[PDB]
């Protein structure tokens, strides 16, 4: 009875379908169906055995021994080996490959040194001891390492093919092979992606869908129309997006799903571009936002105002609902503005250098940017000009620091607060892009990773978070929800609360 094709929207072309380069929710939406790591995420939101059938940990918690599952194969039928993992991780750490997620592998001994030119890749402590054994040594006991091994930077890639064709990842075809529940059988760039069930997947009997058809419709009204005609089985997040004005009606008819997730919506400042190089200007722009108005009137998705970096759903950080400063604090915003102008020798806001606010082309981002533009004009007398870019282009714009203020969202990679902080540890961190670094911040993050006590560790990270908010390299705006509607016959979808979605075991009733 239940159909076996799932029709969904992913809005736009992914940034990369190389797991070692992907850094974004669009790419990740695809790669989380097509690749599998040493571990995978089960329905309870916890890591479990995936490509590794056994995971051993040394007594000190630093050395991991993965036994590769008997008979695991790539989609072309070749065995998945430990050398595929070694190759992939070293590939992501090789500075020549310019992964923005190389820092995700710094947990491994020798990784940072290799990535920053202070060491050989040969001395990164990931080793295929044999075809079925991967040995990994960490700098510190990392209790969430098996969450990291399910993260897409830690996916294997087919070493044989990647050596043959260094552009293997750029198109569907015989040189694009993967090891997950689904495999990618078509990719029309900027059009659509077709995934089909992967008959070489080890746990294929648990996979019920035969086809996932992913379209790329960046018009939220159209996505909802297609859903309402039954041409899509889902409308909304994580991979699609509902029109903000539909949310009242859908909430009222009882069809809307709304779930808080570990994510934050912020405007990044290029702290090396005037006038955003002045902390008082950054603070004026941040304190002058009315986040309650944005979430009530603009987004309408039950998001909560963010005056902090770490989402309050992170155990130990629930007081971030209140945050580090007052929402809509125009009085204090104006005080910061005056202080900044004085430091420049200026008297009025209109004499500041021109400011551009950038975002990725999107119905909702444009509305938020317009609302913020008005708040800046009205509360500070600051005029900004707006510009928008395609998502995959936009990521590179921010990474190259070709911006002044840039909208971004960050979703948790793993269930620990440091994931919201360590992207800003190093100036040249692949996902930083603010030009900011602070020596005490970095010291505190590094100390956090040697502390096993959860209280003392949470306090080190809260101190770090306070330093970050005091230097305001980004303007927090809101903490995310996922909002969607779906065919209620679609069961078995895994949505862990970090904002990802897995269709591995999904089915129509």
């Amino acid at each position: 009875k239940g159909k076996t094709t799932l029709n969904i929207n992913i809005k736009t072309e992914p940034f990369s379908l190389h797991p070692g380069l992907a850094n974004d929710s669009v790419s990740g939406g695809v790669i989380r169906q097509t690749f599998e790591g040493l571990t995978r995420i089960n329905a309870d939101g916890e890591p479990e055995e995936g490509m590794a059938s056994k995971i051993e940990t040394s007594k000190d918690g630093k050395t991991y021994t993965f036994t590769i599952r008997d008979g695991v194969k790539w989609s072309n039928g070749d065995p998945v080996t430990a050398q595929d993992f070694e190759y992939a991780w070293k590939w992501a750490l090789d500075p020549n490959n310019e992964s923005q997620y190389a820092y995700q592998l710094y947990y491994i001994k020798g990784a940072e040194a290799a990535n920053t030119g202070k060491g050989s890749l040969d001395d990164v402590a990931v080793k295929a001891v044999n075809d079925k054994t991967l040995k990994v040594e960490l700098n510190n006991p990392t209790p969430y390492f098996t969450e990291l091994t399910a993260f897409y930077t830690y996916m294997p890639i087919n070493k044989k093919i990647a050596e043959k064709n260094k552009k293997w990842n750029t198109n569907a075809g015989d040189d694009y092979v993967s090891n997950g529940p689904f495999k990618m059988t078509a990719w029309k760039h900027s059009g659509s992606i077709t995934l089909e069930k992967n008959d070489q997947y080890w746990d294929k009997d648990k996979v019920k869908l035969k086809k996932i058809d992913m379209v790329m419709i960046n018009n939220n009204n159209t996505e909802l129309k297609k859903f309402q005609a039954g041409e899509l089985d889902w409308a909304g997040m994580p991979l699609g997006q509902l029109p903000t004005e539909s949310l009242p009606t859908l909430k009222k008819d009882g069809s809307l799903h709304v779930e808080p997730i570990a994510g934050v919506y912020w405007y990044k400042f290029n702290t090396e571009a005037k006038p955003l190089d002045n902390v008082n200007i950054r603070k004026a722009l941040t304190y002058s936002l009315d986040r309650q108005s944005i979430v009530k009137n603009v987004t309408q998705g039950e998001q909560i105002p963010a005056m902090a970096a770490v989402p309050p759903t992170m155990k130990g950080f629930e007081d971030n609902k209140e945050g580090y400063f007052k929402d809509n604090d125009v009085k204090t915003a104006k005080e910061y503005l005056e202080k900044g102008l004085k430091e420049m020798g200026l008297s009025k806001a209109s004499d500041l250098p021109k400011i551009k606010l950038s975002y990725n082309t999107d119905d909702a981002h444009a509305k938020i940017a317009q609302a913020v533009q008005e708040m800046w004009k009205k509360n500070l007398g600051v005029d900004v000009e707006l510009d928008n870019s395609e998502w995959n282009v936009y990521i590179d714009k921010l990474h190259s620091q070709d911006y002044q203020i840039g909208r971004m969202g960050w979703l948790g990679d793993f269930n620990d607060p440091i994931n919201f902080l360590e992207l800003f540890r190093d100036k040249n961190g692949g996902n930083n892009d603010t030009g900011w670094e602070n020596p005490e911040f970095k010291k505190l993050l590094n100390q956090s990773q040697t502390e096993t006590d959860k209280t003392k560790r949470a306090e080190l990270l809260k101190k770090a978070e306070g330093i970050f908010i005091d230097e305001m390299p980004v303007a927090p705006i809101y903490f995310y929800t996922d909002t969607w509607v779906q065919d209620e016959n679609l069961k078995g979808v895994i949505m862990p609360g970090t904002g990802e979605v897995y269709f591995r075991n999904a089915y129509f009733k």
Binding site: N360, G409, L411
Partner: peptide
């Protein structure tokens, strides 16, 4: 990860 960066959210679209």
């Amino acid at each position: 990860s960066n959210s679209s």
